[PDB]
Amino acid sequence: SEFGHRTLASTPALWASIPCPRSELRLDLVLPSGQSFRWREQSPAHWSGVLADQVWTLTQTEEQLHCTVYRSQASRPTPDELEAVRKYFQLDVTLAQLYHHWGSVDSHFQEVAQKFQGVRLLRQDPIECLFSFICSSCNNIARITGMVERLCQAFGPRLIQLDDVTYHGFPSLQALAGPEVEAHLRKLGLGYRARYVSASARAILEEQGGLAWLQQLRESSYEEAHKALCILPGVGTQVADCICLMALDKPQAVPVDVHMWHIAQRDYSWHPTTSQAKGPSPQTNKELGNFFRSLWGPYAGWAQAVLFSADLRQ
DNA sequence: GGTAGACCTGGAC
DNA sequence: GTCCAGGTCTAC
Ligand SMILES: [Ca+2]
Ligand SMILES: [Ca+2]
To answer: Are residues A180 and A230 in the same domain?
Structure first.
């Protein structure tokens, strides 16, 4: 059928697959795990969302990642469009190689890795990543997903509509820094986060040099990027790390939240050594992050995703 | 120089 | 009706 969300069976000629074994990527373990909040399983095993300013539907078989895009005449995705999908999932980074290494240096990682293959990091857009995680503060994933959706619906550009779903592109800096946005976001249920959304948008455009400043961070060292990000209102060590890890190419960045503290204590009998406190605090979180980096290496941020993801399913 | 309390809310024991 | 989720900010 020419309407609604497509499926592999429904409209064969509209799909193109990317070679990708299930071992290298599990959509069901990556898309809804708190990295990106804009993907939905509209129909069993099919995930739809905005990717590179267009709407897509993804679904995988044992060895392939099937992709279909909605733009004027319907047709299978082009190589360039697909190249964008390969880049979004950073498929050049071999998960099997990382799993092997982590497992080799962490008997526990190896035990959990057995049942949670295919967990990797998406390479996201800095702006979408920054505001989505500014909303992550003291918040659960489902609720975060709700705010972000309402936000994009209210300030994002309309793309296309499938069934009763109107997909929007993520809002721009200009739109987010616009007048009365805070109040509007409060009516959308963002709470105090509404202020930070507004404040960081203006801070970027009016004090840091705009979009480029943010994008430039992809060429800056992890320490540099993390330092710079914390300048923005509503951005702490936690959010700063999520952004470094998920959108600024800093794979050693490790977000330290309650989940990771629980993992640290329950699975490694970890405890602060250079800190006064016995629990989460600026000093102890920095220490935990260093512990995980020292344990997993340059891609500690990725290893962190595998466990964080497994800890949600539980 | 580290820490307790304010800031918002839909859903859960 | 408290308790809780990928925290951050700032007054002692
Ligand atoms: Ca929390
Ligand atoms: Ca900050």
So the answer is: yes
Evaluate whether A95 touches A25 at the Cβ level (below 8 Å): yes
Q: Ligand 1 center to residue A11 CA distance, Å?
A: 43
Could you tell me the distance in Å between the CA of residue A219 and the C1' of nucleotide C4? 38
The span from the CA of A160 to the CA of A148, in Å, is 18
* A10 in the same domain as A62: yes
Which bases along strand B come within 7 Å of a protein CB atom?
Answer: 2-3, 7-11
Examine the fold and report which residue of A250, A266, A300 is the final residue of a domain before the chain moves on. A250
Q: Which ligand is nearest to the CA of A235?
A: 2
Number of separate domains in chain A:
3
Picking from A201, A219, A250, the residue at the C-terminal end of a domain is A250
Let me know whether A182 and A289 are in one domain.
Answer: no
Quote the ligand 2 centre to A233 CA distance (angstroms).
Answer: 5
Distance A85 CA to C1 C1' (A): 47
- What's the A287 CA to ligand 1 centre distance in angstroms? 19
CATH no. for residue A178? 1.10.340.30
Cα torsion for A172, A141, A266, A305, to the nearest 10°?
Answer: -40
Name the nt closest to A304 by C-alpha to C1'.
C6
What secondary structure, in 3-state letters, does A79-133 show?
HHHHHHHHHHCCCCCCHHHHHHHHHHHCHHHHHHHCCCCCCCCCCCCHHHHHHHH
Kindly state whether residue A119 falls inside one of the protein's structural domains: no
Distance CA A2, CA A74 (A): 9
Give the CA-trace dihedral at A57, A37, A241, A237, to 10 degrees.
170
User: Shortest CA–C1' contact from A139: which nucleotide?
Assistant: C5
